[PDB]
Amino acid sequence: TEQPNWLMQRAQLTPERIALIYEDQTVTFAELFAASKRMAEQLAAHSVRKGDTAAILLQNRAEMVYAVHACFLLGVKAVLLNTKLSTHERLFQLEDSGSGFLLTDSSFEKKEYEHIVQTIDVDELMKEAAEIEIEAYMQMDATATLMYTSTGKPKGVQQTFGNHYFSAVSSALNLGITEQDRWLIALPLFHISGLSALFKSVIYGMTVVLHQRFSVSDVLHSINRHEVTMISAVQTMLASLLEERCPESIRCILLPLPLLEECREKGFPVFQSYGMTETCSQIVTLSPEFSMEKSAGKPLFSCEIKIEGQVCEPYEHGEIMVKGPNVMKSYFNRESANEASFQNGWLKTGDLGYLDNEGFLYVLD
Amino acid sequence: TEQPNWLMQRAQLTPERIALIYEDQTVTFAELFAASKRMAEQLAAHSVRKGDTAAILLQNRAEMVYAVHACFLLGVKAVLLNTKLSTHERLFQLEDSGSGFLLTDSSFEKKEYEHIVQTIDVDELMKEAAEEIEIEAYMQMDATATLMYTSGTTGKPKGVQQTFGNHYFSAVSSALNLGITEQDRWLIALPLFHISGLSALFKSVIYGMTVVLHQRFSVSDVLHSINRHEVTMISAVQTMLASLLEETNRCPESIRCILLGGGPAPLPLLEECREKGFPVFQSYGMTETCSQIVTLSPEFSMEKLGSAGKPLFSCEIKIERDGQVCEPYEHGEIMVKGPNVMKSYFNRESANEASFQNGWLKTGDLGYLDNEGFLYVLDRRSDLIISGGENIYPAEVESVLLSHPAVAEAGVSGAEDKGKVPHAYLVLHKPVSAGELTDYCKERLAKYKIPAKFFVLDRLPRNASNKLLRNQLKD
Ligand SMILES: Nc1ncnc2c1ncn2[C@@H]1O[C@H](COP(=O)(O)OP(=O)(O)OP(=O)(O)O)[C@@H](O)[C@H]1O
Ligand SMILES: Nc1ncnc2c1ncn2[C@@H]1O[C@H](COP(=O)(O)OP(=O)(O)OP(=O)(O)O)[C@@H](O)[C@H]1O
Ligand SMILES: [Cl-]
Ligand SMILES: [Cl-]
Ligand SMILES: [Cl-]
Ligand SMILES: [Cl-]
Ligand SMILES: [Cl-]
Ligand SMILES: [Cl-]
Ligand SMILES: [Mg+2]
């Protein structure tokens, strides 16, 4: 199975729609495709070729989104390293992933990694002149993105294009799409909650509002300058309900398990969620209509859930197991884990939970 | 490779959303799943077994929706049949599909087919009871779900095998194109045995969206239905659109999308549509692509007169002549590609051979792309007329003949002489000098395209889908 490259096609369809807003600048999908194609050509100098793995160590910046896309446009597996890890946790992942290159800037030490992988500077690269024929097709089964978990030795999740597509498509079926929808990301892009938005973006043709970090003053401000409708966050960011109800603009906040009592019915629409690196973001959600159920919601469309071993009756504890086309086929270079992980199509999550009488998920600490 | 049954799962997730609105009687997804599972067990009692092929012959009713989902839950290929087919045409498709059963009702002549297939009556079937069964919990994406015959406009009708994969991707791409909300409802007033209508049944379970179902298109009933049930989406052909326009000042507030298939809307229909606030999405598509594969948003309606639009997300078009790709505006055959395109015809090897190149399907339509990639559909490759150094595209001519307004229906075929010369066949509102309107044609058409002779009739050779048979006007 295959699909024409999401970014390319998105550009051909609605070229002057806004892809990325970062700082105060704007990128159209026409620009984003042009950006990503340039970088892709400039990496092709440097000997980067189809089939290679390339790691990315960067903060949320326009140039990171180009970087992801330039990899796809080359056919390069991308590894997005967590910048808040120690340098050694990262060197482990570079060797384990088979990375031939690391793309980063001047805020990190390239000398700390040059001994393992050829090192490339984003800004110094953007200035170079280069000749290249892109990959117009994405294979739905090819790995797109290799993301690590971190609880034994972190396993490298092979996230396919297909996984990402079905993740985005299933989230739409669940929350709906709108031509004036805009998603705000104040979370790190190397984490899946933020990487998913990038793919949602090209697939829906939706705008993403990108912030390097979560500043309440600078976030609740750009929500109004830019009319954000969609925002994904953790409890901590939510905690900043300094003002106080929710703007008119916001129709959805996407979420660990909920704390105590909302706080606040008046007046934010908060969606609770259960997901993991292996499910390429959420697989289960709880609509604000029933904020007072617990606790995690029901399975997304096209996805499945059993609390099992074995197959447990309603309201009785067991091992949560997930299934669906948004779930990864296999960990990278983990034969033992792959066999241990999967029972007949299902993924053993290693989590404690049950389903109530109506089939809602309840995750346990 | 596999998904949970969309009806089951929809029933598990949002059990109290309205699935169906028929008459004004409403049916939930829980109720729909129940109805269907019920009907399923009943059918299983008639030796209807997983892997068989039940054909369905029904007017748009709730019981038809049940029957389609039932076949899914039993693992049975559902063949749906055009209820305006002649007995002969109908028996042909029953034989050719390898149908064992024919689910229908008393509105038809059951015993007239009782020799080829085990008939069954939808209503008398609902009355009985049988052993509960299971399940069938999973749709295999690459399995034929439904089998749908083309209209046979250009030869003996082909059976299109439409996979669950196909239907799923058709629903998803359309949603990427049009958006989807909780508040959305879709009104089908065209037959459910047409892909335009059937695909709404799948849009429903997958989105969890209410389908407002009508047994036929009566403009007053539609307008009432639209407002009473707060309909936001409607599928329509050019005549249905022209009628909704006549009977309104402004467009119903509830409506946000009118998906127009079947052919382009002429410029006056559109300006009136823009003046009156009608949001019209023109579209191109076929049975083989499981409804629309190309659409054009209202914003480009006037700017791109005569265009079907651009491909839906995940889908592709291209234009080829003699194996080579075509420059912008260069005429050639429309070819399509996508997860929503059927992978193969049912039992038509010659057609499968000649219609696929590399994942691409040859539609047998001629068209072109403009510099920006917008599609323009000309005409069927088969009804092309070559008056030497042609071409005359009969739809080009026919379009000008309509809007006389003397002309109500117009058709054009090629006679032969010293290469082929265009003849036109007209149905008349009023009387028209002939011509002028040859002069009426002269202004809006190059000299070689104008019809040499004009003939007159009361009806034109149409098949069971009201489609013009141009090869048979010479009669
Ligand atoms: N909202 C949530 N509520 C409860 N538990 C959660 C939630 N989100 C994630 N988890 C837990 O965290 C996991 C997802 O995190 P991730 O997969 O990135 O790391 P991990 O699975 O903890 O680490 P490892 O690589 O060792 O498997 C899930 O297995 C789940 O058990
Ligand atoms: N927007 C449009 N503009 C112009 N022509 C269209 C448009 N939409 C559909 N068509 C025509 O309608 C055809 C689809 O018809 P359908 O598949 O329902 O039966 P059929 O293809 O005519 O029959 P067969 O191929 O078996 O002879 C397309 O091939 C195309 O020729
Ligand atoms: Cl645009
Ligand atoms: Cl959209
Ligand atoms: Cl519900
Ligand atoms: Cl599609
Ligand atoms: Cl929805
Ligand atoms: Cl001549
Ligand atoms: Mg055809």
Side-chain angles (χ1 to χ4, degrees), chain A residues 2-23 26-37 39-46 48 51-105 107-110 112-113 116-121 123 125-126 128-130 134-149 151-152 154 156-192 194-212 214 216 219 221-233 235-237 239-240 246-247 249-256 258 267 269 271 273-286 288 290 292 296-297 299-305 309-310 312 314-318 320-328 330-332 334 336-338 340-342 345-347 349-351 353-356 359-360 362, chain B residues 1-23 26-36 39-46 48 50-83 85-94 96-108 113 115-121 123 125-126 128-130 133 136-155 157-181 184-229 231-248 251-252 254-274 276-296 298 300-302 304 306-319 323 325-342 344-356 358-389 391 393-398 400-412 414-415 417 419 422-429 431 433-435 438-441 443-446 448 450-452 454-456 458 460-465 467-473 475:
Chain A
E2 87 189 352
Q3 298 180 348
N5 186 285
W6 301 334
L7 176 61
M8 192 184 65
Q9 164 151 69
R10 172 51 63 193
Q12 302 159 346
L13 288 177
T14 65
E16 310 307 343
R17 196 170 320 184
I18 291 173
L20 195 76
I21 59 171
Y22 169 53
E23 314 272 54
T26 61
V27 200
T28 63
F29 291 98
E31 291 157 338
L32 184 51
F33 171 85
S36 305
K37 186 194 178 179
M39 190 169 292
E41 273 168 332
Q42 291 154 2
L43 295 165
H46 284 72
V48 179
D52 293 353
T53 302
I56 286 161
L57 173 79
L58 283 174
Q59 311 271 117
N60 293 356
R61 312 164 33 164
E63 295 71 14
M64 193 176 183
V65 183
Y66 310 159
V68 184
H69 282 289
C71 290
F72 301 159
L73 287 172
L74 280 175
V76 161
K77 294 199 274 305
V79 185
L80 304 155
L81 308 164
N82 183 333
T83 65
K84 301 290 181 287
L85 291 171
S86 67
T87 309
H88 60 89
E89 290 163 302
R90 259 168 263 145
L91 291 155
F92 163 80
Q93 297 179 22
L94 279 162
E95 180 186 351
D96 182 66
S97 66
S99 295
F101 313 87
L102 163 74
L103 313 184
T104 182
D105 57 35
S107 69
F108 304 95
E109 185 62 65
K110 75 154 182 174
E112 253 176 14
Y113 311 102
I116 308 176
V117 278
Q118 174 170 340
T119 180
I120 302 192
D121 199 299
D123 311 294
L125 164 86
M126 275 190 313
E128 316 200 30
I134 73 170
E135 304 286 299
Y137 291 108
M138 313 192 334
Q139 319 300 317
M140 296 292 280
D141 316 84
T143 295
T145 275
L146 186 72
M147 175 169 308
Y148 282 82
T149 61
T151 299
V157 175
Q158 296 200 97
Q159 300 172 330
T160 71
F161 282 111
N163 296 136
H164 285 317
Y165 174 87
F166 280 106
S167 174
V169 160
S170 267
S171 189
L173 297 189
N174 190 252
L175 322 168
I177 318 300
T178 281
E179 54 169 338
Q180 57 256 347
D181 259 335
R182 305 196 128 181
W183 204 301
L184 191 145
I185 294 304
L187 293 179
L189 288 182
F190 47 70
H191 181 272
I192 190 52
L195 184 69
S196 83
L198 289 205
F199 297 127
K200 276 177 190 50
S201 169
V202 282
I203 288 168
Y204 309 168
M206 168 188 53
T207 297
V208 149
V209 197
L210 192 54
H211 287 310
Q212 272 221 357
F214 180 71
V216 198
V219 147
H221 144 85
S222 80
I223 288 189
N224 306 320
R225 189 185 186 195
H226 298 111
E227 281 160 298
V228 163
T229 59
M230 310 286 273
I231 165 66
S232 56
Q235 323 205 134
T236 298
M237 298 160 71
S240 325
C246 184
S249 192
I250 299 297
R251 76 194 186 78
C252 165
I253 305 100
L254 189 56
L255 254 186
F271 289 78
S273 59
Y274 173 75
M276 70 194 80
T277 300
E278 281 94 334
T279 51
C280 298
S281 58
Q282 48 281 351
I283 189 144
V284 163
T285 54
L286 192 282
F290 321 114
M292 329 300 186
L300 278 213
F301 196 83
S302 321
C303 310
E304 282 164 278
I305 294 286
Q310 200 80 348
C312 303
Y315 270 107
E316 85 146 302
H317 297 201
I320 295 168
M321 304 210 260
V322 304
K323 195 191 191 252
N326 63 334
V327 188
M328 76 157 277
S330 83
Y331 294 108
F332 183 69
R334 304 312 209 234
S336 164
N338 283 344
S341 312
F342 302 102
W346 293 75
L347 170 84
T349 193
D351 282 291
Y354 66 101
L355 309 169
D356 77 339
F360 293 57
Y362 283 92
Chain B
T1 201
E2 83 170 1
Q3 291 188 43
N5 191 270
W6 310 320
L7 180 40
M8 172 168 74
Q9 175 166 20
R10 180 48 57 175
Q12 297 169 339
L13 297 186
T14 40
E16 298 313 319
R17 288 185 162 189
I18 315 300
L20 208 45
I21 290 182
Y22 187 63
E23 312 297 25
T26 71
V27 176
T28 59
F29 284 112
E31 284 163 349
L32 174 62
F33 173 71
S36 311
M39 175 152 324
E41 286 147 346
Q42 298 165 349
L43 289 153
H46 292 229
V48 181
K50 166 173 175 189
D52 291 341
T53 299
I56 296 172
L57 174 77
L58 300 161
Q59 304 278 63
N60 287 2
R61 292 160 44 193
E63 291 68 23
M64 183 174 203
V65 180
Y66 308 158
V68 177
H69 284 296
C71 295
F72 291 171
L73 293 173
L74 287 199
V76 170
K77 287 182 200 59
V79 176
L80 317 99
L81 294 173
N82 199 327
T83 60
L85 288 177
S86 89
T87 308
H88 184 197
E89 293 151 346
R90 226 173 287 175
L91 292 151
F92 163 66
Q93 289 173 27
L94 289 152
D96 182 48
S97 43
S99 307
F101 311 89
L102 166 57
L103 211 156
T104 167
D105 74 7
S106 67
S107 174
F108 304 98
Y113 313 95
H115 48 293
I116 313 193
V117 291
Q118 192 176 322
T119 47
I120 288 161
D121 179 285
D123 307 285
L125 184 65
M126 286 188 306
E128 45 202 67
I133 61 179
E136 187 149 40
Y138 288 103
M139 292 156 166
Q140 310 290 335
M141 300 293 280
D142 311 286
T144 300
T146 190
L147 170 95
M148 182 169 300
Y149 280 87
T150 62
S151 325
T153 308
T154 67
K158 302 154 272 172
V160 167
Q161 323 192 68
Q162 310 168 336
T163 69
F164 296 93
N166 289 149
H167 293 304
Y168 172 85
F169 277 108
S170 184
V172 173
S173 280
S174 182
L176 290 188
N177 184 207
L178 311 178
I180 46 179
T181 83
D184 257 341
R185 294 160 145 195
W186 204 303
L187 178 146
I188 296 307
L190 287 177
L192 287 181
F193 55 69
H194 276 165
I195 196 43
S196 193
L198 174 54
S199 66
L201 296 193
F202 303 136
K203 285 191 191 90
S204 196
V205 282
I206 291 180
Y207 307 173
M209 171 191 70
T210 298
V211 164
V212 177
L213 180 62
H214 287 219
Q215 217 201 46
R216 57 181 295 266
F217 175 71
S218 148
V219 206
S220 284
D221 287 331
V222 167
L223 289 178
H224 292 163
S225 198
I226 283 178
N227 298 339
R228 157 140 190 237
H229 295 294
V231 167
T232 65
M233 328 271 297
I234 192 184
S235 297
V237 284
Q238 196 161 124
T239 78
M240 298 160 57
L241 176 50
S243 299
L244 290 159
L245 284 189
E246 274 161 14
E247 309 292 329
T248 65
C251 172
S254 183
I255 291 312
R256 64 181 187 85
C257 178
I258 304 176
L259 181 65
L260 185 72
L267 185 38
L269 191 59
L270 297 179
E271 316 186 284
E272 180 188 347
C273 264
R274 199 173 267 180
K276 283 195 185 166
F278 279 73
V280 170
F281 286 84
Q282 301 180 76
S283 96
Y284 169 74
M286 49 203 293
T287 309
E288 287 89 334
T289 68
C290 304
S291 58
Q292 80 251 25
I293 194 187
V294 166
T295 81
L296 180 80
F300 307 86
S301 181
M302 235 65 62
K304 302 290 179 176
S307 168
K310 283 168 169 161
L312 300 167
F313 198 89
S314 303
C315 297
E316 309 170 46
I317 58 185
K318 95 190 186 185
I319 313 251
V325 204
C326 290
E327 311 303 321
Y329 293 95
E330 188 188 4
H331 290 193
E333 185 170 6
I334 304 184
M335 298 192 183
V336 300
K337 183 157 173 303
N340 59 342
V341 193
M342 74 163 189
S344 157
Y345 292 120
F346 182 87
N347 208 79
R348 294 281 182 299
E349 202 74 328
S350 187
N352 282 334
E353 210 69 84
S355 294
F356 294 82
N358 283 85
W360 291 93
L361 173 65
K362 290 192 194 182
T363 73
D365 299 328
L366 303 167
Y368 65 83
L369 303 182
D370 67 17
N371 289 1
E372 286 169 292
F374 294 86
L375 171 69
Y376 295 86
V377 181
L378 301 167
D379 224 334
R380 302 159 174 285
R381 170 162 259 190
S382 71
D383 303 348
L384 178 64
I385 303 173
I386 294 168
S387 207
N391 319 302
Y393 294 103
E396 186 193 9
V397 188
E398 287 160 14
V400 324
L401 275 302
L402 286 59
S403 75
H404 196 309
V407 197
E409 309 174 35
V412 168
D417 59 82
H423 276 95
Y425 304 70
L426 269 58
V427 179
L428 287 162
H429 267 250
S433 42
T438 284
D439 296 304
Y440 185 98
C441 278
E443 301 166 35
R444 311 168 175 68
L445 271 164
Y448 72 124
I450 328 175
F454 300 168
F455 297 156
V456 181
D458 305 324
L460 305 209
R462 302 192 195 269
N463 59 29
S465 305
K467 256 115 163 155
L468 209 157
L469 307 167
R470 280 179 267 244
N471 53 334
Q472 209 198 338
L473 287 154
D475 275 310

